[PDB]
Point group: C2
Chain length 97, copies 2
C-alpha cells in the first residue's frame, strides 16, 4: 500500500522555534506532492526538543521525487545547524488504508 517512514529528530533547546518554522515549509510543500499521503509533524509530549516526522508516499517513485524537491533540499540545509545528533529513521510497510 504505502511507503512509510517515521524519523526522530532532536534539536538544540534554543532552536525549537526555528526547527518548527523550517519544517513548516517542508510540510507545506510536501503535502502538495502528487504521491504524498501524509507528512505529519509530531512533537514529543515531554521533550519539547524531540520531533517525529510521519511521512507516507504512494510508492517508491514518490519517495524519490520527494528528495529532489526544492522544499526538501532547503530543509536539509537549514536543519544541519539545528540537530543535537543524527536523525533516527524507521521504515514501515503501510498496509492500511
Amino acid at each position: 500500500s504505502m511507503h512509510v517512514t517515521l524519523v526522530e529528530i532532536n534539536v538544540h533547546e534554543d532552536k525549537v522555534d526555528e526547527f518548527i518554522e523550517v519544517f513548516r515549509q517542508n510540510h507545506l510543500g510536501s503535502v502538495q506532492e502528487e504521491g504524498n499521503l501524509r507528512f505529519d509533524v509530531l512533537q514529543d509530549p515531554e521533550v519539547n526538543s524531540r520531533f517525529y516526522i510521519y511521512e507516507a508516499y504512494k510508492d517508491e517513485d514518490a519517495v524519490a521525487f520527494h528528495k529532489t524537491t526544492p522544499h526538501y533540499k532547503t530543509c536539509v540545509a537549514k536543519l544541519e545547524s539545528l540537530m543535537t545528533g543524527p536523525r533516527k529513521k524507521r521504515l514501515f510497510n503501510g498496509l492500511m488504508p
Copy 2:
C-alpha cells in the same frame, strides 16, 4: 496540546498468525476510520519482522481517543487478538503540530 493526538501502538503476534492478525485487525481499521473523531488509523508492518505491527492512531481530541475503546469493533478486535498477540500492546504518545 496539538492539532491532533497520536498514539503509535506496537502489536506483536505469533509468527504463524501474521495473516490472521491482518484479517482481524482490518475490521478495527475500517470501523475506526469511521469514528467522528478519527484522523488516521494507519496499519504499519515492520519490514524486517513480519509479525511486528504499529498502528498510527490519530484523533482530534481525547474524548474521541477514549470513545474508540468503547466501540463494538474495538472490543471484538481485543477479544480476537487474545489468541494472536505475544504479549501486551505497547504505546507511544505524540502531539500533532501539522496538519
